[PDB]
């Protein structure tokens, strides 16, 4: 029982480590009133500087390619993007 709960916590933490915006309920609010060094986070999607005429393509993905170089893999299903270089 208790060991099962501990294993659940460990597995959930490991899984949510590889996540863009994992949903973690917190007992207390965090203090981030200072407006500096708030941009270096794993949930900071997009780019620092973005143009209106940038080309974006949405594809099904296998694995977790977030913030990584992606390659096209063709298999039946449509080809998918996978973390690779």
């Amino acid at each position: 029982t208790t060991q099962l709960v501990k294993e659940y916590q460990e597995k959930r933490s490991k899984l949510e480590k590889f996540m863009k915006n994992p949903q973690h309920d917190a007992s207390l609010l965090s203090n981030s009133n200072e407006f500096r060094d708030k941009n270096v986070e794993f949930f900071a999607s997009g780019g620092t500087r973005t143009s209106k005429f940038d080309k974006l393509e949405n594809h099904p993905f296998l694995g977790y390619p977030y913030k990584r170089g992606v390659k096209r893999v063709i298999q039946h299903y449509e080809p998918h993007v996978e973390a690779g270089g």
Binding site: D54, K55, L56, E57, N58, E78
Partner: protein, 53 residues
């Protein structure tokens, strides 16, 4: 192509194409010639029960 899922921001979308087809029907004119007897010559060919040589 397959439809594009509208999730987050995307600029490249699948396209629907169109095409035109022109259909042509031809009409041809043909002719035949046939021989017969002159109208003012039948009396010299009318037999007992038929007309013609």
């Amino acid at each position: 192509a397959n439809p594009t899922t509208i999730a987050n921001e995307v600029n490249t979308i699948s396209t629907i194409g169109f095409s035109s087809e022109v259909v042509r029907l031809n009409y041809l004119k043909l002719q035949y010639k046939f021989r017969h007897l002159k109208q003012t010559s039948e009396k010299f060919y009318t037999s007992d029960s038929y007309i013609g040589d």
